DNA sequence: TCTGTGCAGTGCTCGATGTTTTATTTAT
């Protein structure tokens, strides 16, 4: 019923260099629909069910920043994305505002740019849960977590 | 005369038609009465009058006698004996000492009776929202009750007019009985405690007048002078003939239609130990300070169980119970205790809100305890926001969002109460209380967001907002068992 | 039928037409979702204070009330409480062949009769009476020349009306207007540039605003309207009703309009007669979803709702609809009007 | 078995008063006794000064109110409160004259997504008959509304008529069943009461006496 | 007809003409679709600060909250007409604030000021104390002829058009102005998903990479501009001006609404586009055409052609449905038809 | 045949003033 976030994280990690490069050169989440390697990656995670499609597009597009940009770290809730971006000490607060205010597709593009810069260490299944809904509530909590960390 | 003639508006405990009895009929029969007026605040004012009367005419010599008179009405001979030395001070129309009045008031105009009707007038919106002519003709009972209410619970008429000894708009808290007779007796301090309560000028303000611009040490006021204190110079006009009272709707031979008043000021230094109100204990420097409780920025209330809400706030939040309540606890520590209570929220002369519980269990306590917890969680979160808002040099209503949201809390949660109370029983109690928590949790989030919504897109306030919401969820998590 | 139901769907461009004490847009929860709201009192005042209202209602022919023509019926109405001596003395001092009489007129005069009756008993007259009742007399004289306005909207917030019969309700009842759809409001972050300040602005602020397809509902009590016009005819009442239809379609509250300018006319207007007045708000209880705008799906949802419940709700009776849109129409039981004026004429002609 | 008149009170906004003398106009959770009488008194052509038939209506009729939960798409929608900041320009300063304030402030509470089903029966010494009360709600003389004139009905006032043993048994015939009932007549398995001051004193205009509902919880 | 409605469809090339607290394009939801927005206050300030306004209307008002700085401006400007004492008291009475020599004196809020209007006031103040007339009665006198005060707004027309409020001083009573022009926020006729420019700043002392990497929102858009002018209100606000005077001012607004574009980001985006359609219509009640685009315009050989077409179709629908017959004229590059804007403006000047 | 100073008569705006307030501050 729910996407196995760690399984997908592992699948992306041990992906062959070819399939990985084909996914990484995508410039926005919807372009993943043109990549055969993308479909094979997310098929065992419920892609053919339309319920999961928008979530899987966000998850994989965030991962597509690189195999080594998002480092999963186990809980001791676990490190949220907002706290993780602040933990890097590289991201200006203004860029977080611009992220949480952005509309569709543009938000994912800006997020991935932030992930590239920040190289966050976080709780990946927790971030995936956030990417699944990605409502106005999740976006405000992102900004507030970032601010509460700094 | 309040001690002789009929003026007490009652109807049988579970009966029907209103009848006007006298103090003797109340004190000397096993008849079950309950006060009956169109207004709860006036029913409380009446009871306060009755209690203050019974406090001077018949304090029990000990707890043993205290318990006796409650179960056994006095005989008419005993009553006449006790009221005999007091008849002189309870005349409405009188030559030199009218009840709670002042002969020789210098006033150019005659003040309408509505000014004693606490809330019917007082604000610029009153003439638009209220029914006219509620004070065109007041019976004898309502007039005395209204006078007593103005001196105790209501704020002053305006500039140059002073408020009661407990201050403006105090909360009055009485021990509740099975009927009117028991309730009155239940709130009369026995002679020993009476002496311990008041360790003076023991004559009324309408017999021994207050001197203009004089400073009065609180310790220099007798208990009858204080209980029947009149801070204002008021003089009734000559009443009129038989007809309906515009306040209670009953027929009356004498009906007052106006009164005279004049500016009159003084100063009571210190705090008079009034036995009818709970207080707040604060320690500033090395001294102990007391402040009588009042509905300040909110008036905590729920339908059906407001007395329980107020009771728990006193019991839990430096609050201390009223002296009459402290007595009852000592006399019957194991006996269950419910309140008869009331007060006003005011903006100076304007009455903004009325909350009164006048009627004559552990689950309910648990429900109230749970309710207050979420209330407190919300307050701490929004006070955190309001302080941060202030420290950030922002101006506007952002510094008091915790006040509005608290008022909205009670009003929004009141809608949940009828269904909660209807489904409470032995086996369902834990389930309906759990459901209440989820409801109140959701409500707190809604009210937080609502209070904070006008300050979206204020980037300089994001750390204040974030801290405030984090505070809210921290306290919300502590509330789930 | 006694009631005229007026249904309006009107689309507004980005604006803030009605706000509260925090300057936030007014709203309401309907069907569990937030709708932007324009209050009853705001909408009604926009009508009552409009120029169109002043010309067609404020300057009506039935506007004026003549105490002279009302002497007979007043003489028998108050004839059991008062005798003709006082009744005629009162009737003349207020002014200096009528069949019926407006209820508040009877009641207010009856109050004046009580005063002069007590004036003769207390044995005072001349100017003393006209000094005491100076403002009161001036009050009723003004009200006697605003009879249609009082019959339609009710008495003013300050009227000098004295009695219970003087509590005059409007014959038209205006509901709170709410959007047919859920709304998340926008925010305008603004500056005020100081001409004498080098760095930055002298003020910063925010203002909440949004668009919205609103549903306006109003009904008219015909018998009440006639009865408060001294016993006017159905035709005369239907003529007044025609003006209400026009105002509910065109009048918009002035708030924030200087800077947001949402001067939009209604895209759909429908009128129907019934014995029991009903709002069709539950057409939008399930919030309308956008499909090439909110307006077309709203009219569509309004039409589909009528087709479903009108019969069972007893909304048989004369029904007509005007629309700027070519959306698939309601049941053929509703007569389509191509212009607003044709719709209004249809109302004058009793349907 | 007695005859019952069944009414439906549905609309996007409702208001049912609680004691006040202030610019705050509060609402309760379900319709008041005074409010139901006024609604009936509106359907009938009763004027505010006609205390005679005003008292004839009150002595003839008793009520039972059921709270109905809005179900939408098979989902439950709860009743919420609403606070209206309601101002008045040029409002009367006194009860006679034409002097007025620039602006006054009031605060009015409404219920949202609320609906009610009302059972109605005649007292043993009633004046009217349910047959003429049925006529009144089908063809009202004054405009009917839910507490305030700004609050229209979205469903017909009339729901049905029936015969039954107690008000609870009568309301059973009409969906949706399950909501809590507040009745003026007590039903056997229930003993809870709901105190209120919403009994209009008809000899004393706009004043109210204390009374009590019998509480009947839904399953 | 008392109202002059003005309708403009103007297309802009990629730009960022109006942005918010986070430097992102202002927008609005209309018809369930995001539209790029230009605030009415941005439009009004672009017009009042423009060269055209200066040449054809006059001096824009002085809007400030800094009375100490204002004090010094008036002393330098009204020095040769009045003594420094009178100038100081005049500002003090109007603002309700103590005008001394303090470095910082602040008003209640930002307020528009007209020098010519202040000049008129200090005359009265001088004559007042000369006739030994105190301030309380001076105010009572001045309240009796507000029209004589409003004639000074011919030196500050943007106030007559856009309004003024004050909460302290004599301006509370004497300076209350309800603007004659109503104006909407410009919104795009179509849905816009804004573009994002990813930019660098190359550092001449840094050989590896750039010194700054950033993003900037921008987009194109066909915008609908709406405004109307209340002629009777404009005359009253100018102290009782003639209809010809009001009509000529309205004509300049028409010109500015068709040609004036906010300056924001124009140095690096240069969207200096004039309108492709202007429509003027006299009416008794204000009429906006915004609902022509409630259903967002779909592109079809651009957004401009289908926008103008949508405008025309909705105009006919309203005119036919509401039976409107106020005078109307239309200028276009893509109802009386006007080949040039100038002919359109003569038309308005001549009462339609 | 209209109008003028005294009113009586009061409609007011004027100002000082009765009272009284505070509760917090994540997660790492
Ligand atoms: Zn009474």
DSSP string, B69-94: HHHSPPPHHHHHHHHGGGGGG--SS-
What φ, ψ does residue E167 adopt, rounded to 5°?
-115, 0
DSSP secondary structure letter of residue B400: G
B265 beta carbon < 7 A from strand F?
yes
Query: Residue D197 CA to chain centroid, in angstroms?
Result: 14
What φ, ψ does residue E265 adopt, rounded to 5°?
65, 15
Asked if B308 and B364 touch (Cβ cutoff 8 Å), the reply is: yes
Give B466's contacts in chain A (Cβ within 8 Å).
143-145, 147-148
CA gap B4, B321 in Å, rounded: 33
CA dihedral D66, D71, D76, D79 (to 10 degrees): -50
Buried residues in B132-149 as b, exposed as e (16+ CB within 10 A)? bebbbbbbbbbbbbbbbb
Q: Give the contacts of D172 (CB within 8 A, at least 6 positions apart).
A: none
Q: Which helix (H) or strand (E) holds E30?
A: strand E27-30
DSSP secondary structure letter of residue B138: B
Q: Quote helix, strand, coil % in chain D, to nearest 5.
A: 15, 40, 40
B473 beta carbon < 7 A from strand F?
yes
CA gap A112, D49 in Å, rounded: 74
Asked if E87 and E122 touch (Cβ cutoff 8 Å), the reply is: yes
Q: What are the residues facing E7 on neighbouring strands? A: E226, E279
Chain D and chain E touch, per 3+ beta carbon pairs within 8 A: no
B130: CA distance to ligand 1 center in Å?
A: 18
CA gap A67, E16 in Å, rounded: 36
- Whether chain C has a CB inside 8 Å of the CB on D82: the answer is yes
**Which residues 112-171 in chain D show a CB within 8 A of chain B?**
none
CA gap C333, C335 in Å, rounded: 6
Asked if D77 and D113 touch (Cβ cutoff 8 Å), the reply is: yes
What φ, ψ does residue C222 adopt, rounded to 5°?
-65, -50
B383 beta carbon < 7 A from strand F?
yes
Q: What is the DSSP string of chain A?
A: ----HHHHHHHHHT--HHHHHHHHT-SSGGGGGG-HHHHHHHGGGTTTSGGGHHHHHHHHHHHTT-TTTSEE--------HHHHHHHTT---HHHHHHHHH--TTHHHHHHHHHHHHH--EE-HHHHHHHHHH--HHHHHHHHHHHHHH-
Taking each helix axis from N to C end, the angle separating A53-63 and A124-133, rounded to the nearest 10 degrees, works out to: 130
Across B77-152, where does the E strand assignment appear?
A: none
Nearest to B185 by CA among B351, B308, B73: B73
**Is the CA virtual torsion B285, B290, B295, B298 positive or negative?**
positive
Q: Give the contacts of C21 (CB within 8 A, at least 6 positions apart).
A: D85, D105
Nearest to B172 by CA among B289, B342, B28, B309: B342
Burial of B263 (0-12, 13-18, 19+ CB in 10 A): middle
- Whether chain B has a CB inside 8 Å of the CB on D199: the answer is no
CA gap E69, B232 in Å, rounded: 53
CA gap B74, B57 in Å, rounded: 13
Q: Enumerate the domain spans of chain A.
A: 1-150
Q: Which helix (H) or strand (E) holds B24?
A: helix B23-27
Q: In what order do the strands lie in the sheet with B319-320?
A: B287-292, B279-284, B319-320
Domains by residue range for chain D, with CATH: 1-219 (3.30.70.2660)
B135: CA distance to ligand 1 center in Å?
A: 10
CA gap B137, B149 in Å, rounded: 18
CA gap C101, C73 in Å, rounded: 7
Burial of C199 (0-12, 13-18, 19+ CB in 10 A): exposed
Q: What are the residues facing B371 on neighbouring strands? A: none
CATH superfamily to which A1-150 belongs: CRISPR-associated protein Cse2 (1.10.520.40)
**Which residues 113-142 in chain D show a CB within 8 A of chain C?**
113, 137-142
Helices in chain D by DSSP H: which ranges?
Answer: 33-43, 51-60, 130-138, 167-171
CA gap E17, E24 in Å, rounded: 10
Give C198→chain D minimum CA distance, Å: 39
B295 beta carbon < 7 A from strand F?
no
A75 beta carbon < 7 A from strand F?
no
Nearest to B375 by CA among B222, B269, B479: B479
Instruction: Give a three-class secondary structure readout of E177-238.
Output: ECCCEEECCEEECCCCCCEEEEEEECCCCCCCCCCEEEEEEEEEEEEEEEEEEEHHHHHHHC
B38 beta carbon < 7 A from strand F?
no
Nearest to E223 by CA among E193, E258, E188, E183: E188
A104: CA distance to ligand 1 center in Å?
A: 69
CA gap C220, E31 in Å, rounded: 32
What SS3 state is found at B187?
coil
- Of the candidates E64, E226, E314, the beta carbon closest to that of C194 is on E64
Asked if E251 and E258 touch (Cβ cutoff 8 Å), the reply is: no
Nearest to B255 by CA among B167, B143, B359: B143
CA gap E256, E274 in Å, rounded: 10
Q: How many CB atoms lie within 10 A of CB C236?
A: 16
Nearest to E171 by CA among E61, E275, E258: E61
B42: CA distance to ligand 1 center in Å?
A: 10
Report how far apart, in Å, the C-alpha atoms of C76 and of each of C68, C98, C108, C166 are.
14, 12, 15, 20
| Chain-chain contact of C196 with E69 (C-beta, under 8 angstroms) | yes
Phi-psi region for residue B304, left (φ > 0), alpha (ψ -120 to 50) or beta? left
Give E196→chain A minimum CA distance, Å: 8
- B379: which nucleotide lies closest, measuring CA to C1'? F23
Burial of B441 (0-12, 13-18, 19+ CB in 10 A): middle
Nearest to B140 by CA among B38, B251, B11, B262: B251
CA gap A131, A120 in Å, rounded: 15
Q: Is the peptide bond before D24 cis (omega within 30 degrees of 0)?
A: no
Experimentally, how was this structure solved? X-ray
Buried residues in C68-92 as b, exposed as e (16+ CB within 10 A)? eebbebbeebbeeebeeebbebbbe
Resolution expressed in Å: 2.5
Nearest to E329 by CA among E234, E235, E242, E258: E258
- Whether chain C has a CB inside 8 Å of the CB on D71: the answer is no
Q: What are the residues facing E34 on neighbouring strands? A: E29
Q: How many CB atoms lie within 10 A of CB B367?
A: 23
| Chain-chain contact of B459 with E20 (C-beta, under 8 angstroms) | no
Asked if C253 and C276 touch (Cβ cutoff 8 Å), the reply is: no
Chain A and chain E touch, per 3+ beta carbon pairs within 8 A: yes
Q: How many CB atoms lie within 10 A of CB A119?
A: 16
Q: Enumerate the domain spans of chain B.
A: 1-368, 369-481
CA gap B362, D131 in Å, rounded: 48
Asked if C184 and C209 touch (Cβ cutoff 8 Å), the reply is: no
Nearest to B266 by CA among B226, B214, B225, B314: B214
Asked if D125 and D119 touch (Cβ cutoff 8 Å), the reply is: no
CA gap A42, A19 in Å, rounded: 12
Query: Residue E131 CA to chain centroid, in angstroms?
Result: 41
Q: Enumerate the domain spans of chain E.
A: 1-352
Burial of E23 (0-12, 13-18, 19+ CB in 10 A): middle
CA gap B340, B177 in Å, rounded: 9
CA gap B399, A86 in Å, rounded: 29
Burial of A29 (0-12, 13-18, 19+ CB in 10 A): buried
What SS3 state is found at D158?
strand
Give E22→chain A minimum CA distance, Å: 7
Q: Which chains touch D (3 or more CB pairs under 8 A)?
A: B, C
Asked if B190 and B62 touch (Cβ cutoff 8 Å), the reply is: yes
| Chain-chain contact of C219 with D151 (C-beta, under 8 angstroms) | no
Burial of C196 (0-12, 13-18, 19+ CB in 10 A): middle
User: For residue B182, how many C-alpha atoms fall within 13 Å in the half-sphere facing its CB?
Assistant: 19
What SS3 state is found at E77?
helix
Report the chain B residue with the minimal C-alpha distance to residue E20. Answer: B457
Strand pairing class (E212-230; E277-283): unpaired
Q: How far is the CA of B473 from the C1' of F24 (A)?
A: 14
B244 beta carbon < 7 A from strand F?
no
Q: Which helix (H) or strand (E) holds E158?
A: helix E157-162
D213: CA distance to ligand 1 center in Å?
A: 27
Q: What is the DSSP string of B371-386?
A: HHHHHHHHHHHHHHHH
H and E: helices and strands count for chain D: 4, 11
B162 beta carbon < 7 A from strand F?
yes
Q: How far is the CA of E189 from the C1' of F18 (A)?
A: 61
How many C×D Cβ pairs under 8 Å?
Answer: 151
- Whether chain D has a CB inside 8 Å of the CB on B445: the answer is no
Q: Which of C46, C213, C257, C258 to mutate to test the interface with E (most CBs of E within 10 A)?
A: C258
| Chain-chain contact of C189 with B457 (C-beta, under 8 angstroms) | yes
Q: Which helix (H) or strand (E) holds B445?
A: helix B429-452
Report the chain E residue with the minimal C-alpha distance to residue B460. Answer: E21
Q: Which chains touch A (3 or more CB pairs under 8 A)?
A: B, E
Q: How many CB atoms lie within 10 A of CB A82?
A: 27
CA gap B368, B316 in Å, rounded: 11
Asked if E215 and E24 touch (Cβ cutoff 8 Å), the reply is: no
Give B457's contacts in chain E (Cβ within 8 Å).
20-21
């Amino acid at each position: 019923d729910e996407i196995d976030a760690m399984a997908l994280y592992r699948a992306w990690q041990q992906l062959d260099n070819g399939s990985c490069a084909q996914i990484r050169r995508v410039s926005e989440p919807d372009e993943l629909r043109d990549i055969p390697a993308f479909y094979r990656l997310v098929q065992p995670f419920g892609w053919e069910n339309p319920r999961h499609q928008q979530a899987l597009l966000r998850m994989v597009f965030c991962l597509s920043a690189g195999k080594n940009v998002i480092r999963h770290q186990d809980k001791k809730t676990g490190i949220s994305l907002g706290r993780a971006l602040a933990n890097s000490g590289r991201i200006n607060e203004r860029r977080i505002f611009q992220l949480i205010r952005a509309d569709r597709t543009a938000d994912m593009v800006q997020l991935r740019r932030l992930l590239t810069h920040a190289e966050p260490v976080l709780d990946w299944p927790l971030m995936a849960r956030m990417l699944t809904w990605w409502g106005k509530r999740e976006r405000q909590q992102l900004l507030e977590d970032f601010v509460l960390t700094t | 005369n309040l001690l002789i003639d009929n003026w007490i508006p009652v109807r049988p405990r579970n009966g029907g038609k209103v009848q006007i009895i006298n103090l003797q009929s109340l004190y000397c029969s096993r008849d079950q009465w309950r006060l009956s007026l169109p207004r709860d605040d006036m029913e409380l004012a009446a009871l306060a009058l009755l209690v203050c009367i019974g406090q001077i005419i018949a304090p029990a010599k000990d707890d043993v006698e205290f318990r006796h008179r409650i179960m056994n009405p006095l005989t008419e001979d005993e009553f006449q004996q006790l009221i005999a030395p007091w008849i002189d001070m309870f005349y409405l129309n009188h030559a030199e000492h009218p009840f709670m009045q002042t002969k020789g008031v210098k006033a150019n105009d005659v003040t309408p009776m509505e000014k004693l009707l606490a809330g019917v007038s007082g604000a610029t919106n009153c003439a638009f929202v209220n029914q006219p002519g509620q004070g065109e003709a007041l019976c004898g009972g309502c007039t005395a009750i209204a006078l007593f209410n103005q001196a105790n619970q209501a704020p002053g008429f305006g500039g140059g007019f002073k408020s009661g000894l407990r201050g403006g708009t105090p909360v009055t808290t009485f021990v509740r009985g099975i009927d009117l007779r028991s309730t009155v007796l239940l709130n009369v301090l026995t002679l020993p405690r009476l002496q311990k309560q008041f360790p003076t000028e023991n004559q009324p303000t309408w017999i021994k007048p207050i001197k203009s611009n004089e400073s009065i040490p609180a310790s220099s006021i007798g208990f009858v002078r204080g209980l029947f204190w009149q801070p204002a110079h008021i003089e009734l006009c000559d009443p009129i003939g038989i007809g309906k009272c515009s306040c209670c709707g009953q027929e009356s031979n004498l009906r007052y239609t106006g009164f005279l008043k004049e500016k009159f000021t003084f100063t009571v230094n210190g705090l008079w130990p009034h036995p009818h109100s709970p207080c707040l204990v604060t320690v500033k420097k090395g001294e102990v300070e007391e402040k009588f409780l009042a509905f300040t920025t909110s008036a905590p209330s729920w339908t059906q169980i407001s007395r329980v809400v107020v009771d728990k706030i006193i019991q839990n939040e430096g609050n201390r119970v009223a002296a009459v309540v402290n007595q009852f606890r000592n006399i019957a520590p194991q006996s269950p205790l419910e309140l008869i209570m009331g007060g006003y929220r005011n903006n100076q002369a304007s009455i903004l809100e009325r909350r009164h519980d006048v009627l004559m269990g552990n689950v309910i306590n648990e429900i109230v305890t749970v309710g207050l917890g979420y209330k407190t969680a919300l307050r701490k979160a929004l006070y955190t926001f309001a302080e941060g808002f202030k420290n950030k040099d922002f101006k506007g209503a952002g510094v008091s969002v915790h006040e509005t949201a608290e008022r909205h809390f009670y009003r929004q949660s009141e809608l949940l109460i009828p269904d909660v109370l209807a489904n409470v029983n032995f086996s369902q109690a834990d389930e309906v209380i759990a459901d209440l928590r989820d409801k109140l949790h959701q409500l707190c989030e809604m009210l937080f967001n609502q209070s904070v919504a006008p300050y979206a897109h204020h980037p300089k306030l994001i750390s204040t907002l974030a801290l405030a919401r984090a505070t809210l969820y921290k306290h919300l998590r502590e509330l789930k068992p | 039928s006694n009631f005229i139901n007026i249904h309006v769907l009107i689309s507004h461009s980005p604006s803030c037409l009605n706000r509260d004490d925090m300057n936030m847009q007014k709203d309401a929860i309907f069907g569990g979702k937030r709708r932007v709201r324009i209050s009853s009192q705001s909408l009604k005042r926009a009508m009552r204070k409009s120029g169109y209202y002043a010309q067609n209602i404020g300057e009506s022919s039935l506007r004026t009330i003549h105490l002279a023509q009302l002497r007979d019926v007043l003489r028998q109405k108050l004839g059991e409480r008062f005798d003709q001596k006082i009744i005629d003395k009162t009737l003349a001092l207020l002014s200096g062949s009528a069949d019926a009489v407006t209820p508040w007129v009877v009641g207010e005069i009856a109050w004046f009769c009580e005063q002069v009756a007590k004036a003769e008993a207390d044995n005072l007259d001349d100017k003393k009476l006209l000094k005491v009742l100076k403002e009161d007399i001036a009050a009723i004289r003004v009200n006697l020349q605003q009879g249609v306005d009082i019959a339609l909207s009710g008495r003013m917030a300050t009227s000098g009306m004295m009695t219970e019969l003087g509590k005059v309700d409007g014959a038209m009842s205006i509901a709170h207007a709410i959007t047919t759809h859920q709304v998340d409001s926008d925010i305008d972050w603004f500056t005020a540039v100081d001409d004498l300040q080098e760095q930055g602005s002298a003020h910063l602020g925010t203002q909440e605003f949004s668009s919205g397809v609103f549903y306006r509902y109003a009904n008219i009590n015909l018998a009440q309207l006639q009865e408060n016009l001294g016993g006017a005819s159905r035709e005369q009442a239907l003529e007044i009703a025609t003006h209400v239809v026009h105002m509910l379609a065109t009048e918009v509250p002035g708030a924030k309009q200087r800077t947001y300018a949402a001067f939009n006319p209604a895209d759909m207007v429908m009128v129907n007669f019934s014995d029991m007045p009903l709002s069709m708000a539950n057409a939008f209880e399930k919030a309308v979803k956008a499909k090439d705008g909110f307006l077309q799906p709203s009219i569509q949802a309004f039409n589909q709702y009528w087709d479903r419940v009108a019969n069972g709700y007893g909304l048989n009776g004369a029904a007509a609809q005007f629309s700027l849109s070519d959306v698939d129409p309601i049941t053929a039981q509703v007569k389509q009007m191509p212009t607003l004026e044709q719709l209004k004429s249809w109302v004058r002609n009793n349907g | 078995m007695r005859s019952y008149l069944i009414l439906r009170l549905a609309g996007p906004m409702q208001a049912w008063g609680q004691p006040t003398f202030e610019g705050t106009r509060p609402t309760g959770r379900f319709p008041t006794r005074s409010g139901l009488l006024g609604l009936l008194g509106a359907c009938l052509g009763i004027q505010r000064d006609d205390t005679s038939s005003l008292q004839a209506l009150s002595e003839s009729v008793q009520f039972a109110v059921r709270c109905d939960e809005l179900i939408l798409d098979d989902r439950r929608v709860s009743v919420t409160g609403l606070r209206d900041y309601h101002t008045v320009l040029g409002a009367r300063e006194d009860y006679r004259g034409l002097k007025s304030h620039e602006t006054i402030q009031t605060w009015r509470e409404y219920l949202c997504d609320a609906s009610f089903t009302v059972a109605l029966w005649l007292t043993p010494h009633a004046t009217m008959v349910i047959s003429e009360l049925e006529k009144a709600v089908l063809k009202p003389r004054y405009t009917p509304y839910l507490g305030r004139r700004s609050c229209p009905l979205t469903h017909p006032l009339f729901l049905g008529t029936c015969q039954a043993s107690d008000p609870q048994k009568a309301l059973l015939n009409y969906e949706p069943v399950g909501g809590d009932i507040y009745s003026e007549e007590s039903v056997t398995g229930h003993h809870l009461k709901f105190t209120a001051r919403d009994e209009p004193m008809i000899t004393l205009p706009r004043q109210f006496a204390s009374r009590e509902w019998y509480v009947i919880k839904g399953g």
